[PDB]
Amino acid sequence: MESHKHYTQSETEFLLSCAETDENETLDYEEFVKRFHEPAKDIGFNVAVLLTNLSEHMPNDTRLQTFLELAESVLNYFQPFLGRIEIMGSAKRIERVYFEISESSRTQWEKPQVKESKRQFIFDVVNEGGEKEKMELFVNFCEDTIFEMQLAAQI
């Protein structure tokens, strides 16, 4: 663990005294705090969403900058996991909603058959089709794509 060059050594020993103390020295990595660390991952995810939105609404604050860079490794972990869009949330103003993206849906989105259906859909929405309800046809494609990844993961 210390050969992984990463941590601070007193905190490695903190994790050691945390670890299992399982009767000789043995330890299962999954049963460590890991299984409870994914809800801790959820908490830190929400914290990352929070600090993100703090920077996004109200930028340019060196207090917040120090607090942000203080939380550097969390934003390093969770940018593969966050979800972010923009909408008009009934306030007649441009808004943005930050949210969660699970990973297994991205693994079934990693399936490039979806990507080529997507690129053909790009061709469709650009030219091949009556420009009628653009984003509604997009969401029709999305619901179909949802069903596609349901099929893909369910195998």
Partner 1 sequence: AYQQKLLNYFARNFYNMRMLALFVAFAINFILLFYKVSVHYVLEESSGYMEPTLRILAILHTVISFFCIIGYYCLKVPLVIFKREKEVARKLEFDGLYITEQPSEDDIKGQWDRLVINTQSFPNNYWDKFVKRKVMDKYGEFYGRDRISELLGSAVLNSIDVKYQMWKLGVVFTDNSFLYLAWYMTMSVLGHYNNFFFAAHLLDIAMGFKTLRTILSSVTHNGKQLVLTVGLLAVVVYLYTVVAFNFFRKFYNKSEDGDTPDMKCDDMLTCYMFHMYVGVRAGGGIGDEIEDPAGDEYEIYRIIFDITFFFFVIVILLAIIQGLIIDAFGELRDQQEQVKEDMETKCFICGIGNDYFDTVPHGFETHTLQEHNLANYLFFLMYLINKDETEHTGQESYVWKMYQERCWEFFPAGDCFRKQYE
Q: Which is nearer to partner 1, 31 or 144 (CB)?
A: 144
> Tokens representing 71?
């939380």
Q: Which is nearer to partner 1, 32 or 114 (CB)?
A: 114
Whether the Cβ atoms of residue 18 and residue 44 lie closer than 8 Å to each other: no
Work out which of 72, 90, 107, 129 binds partner 1, going by CB under 8 A. 90
Burial class (CB in 10 A: 0-12, 13-18, 19+), 120: exposed
Total residues interacting with partner 1, rule: CB under 8 A: 46
> Tokens representing 54?
């703090």
Residue 18 interacting with partner 1 (CB under 8 A): no
Residues 105-144 that bind partner 1 (CB under 8 A): 105-106, 109, 118, 122-123, 125-128, 131, 133-136, 138-140, 142-144
Q: Which of 83, 75, 70, 69 is CA-nearest to residue 44?
A: 75
Residue 58 interacting with partner 1 (CB under 8 A): no
Q: What is the 3-state secondary structure (H, E, C) of 97-130?
A: EEEECCCHHHHHHCCHHHHHHHHHHHHHHHCCCC
Work out which of 42, 100, 107, 129 binds partner 1, going by CB under 8 A. 100
Q: Interface residues with partner 1 (CB under 8 A)? A: 5, 83-90, 93-97, 99-102, 105-106, 109, 118, 122-123, 125-128, 131, 133-136, 138-140, 142-149, 151, 155
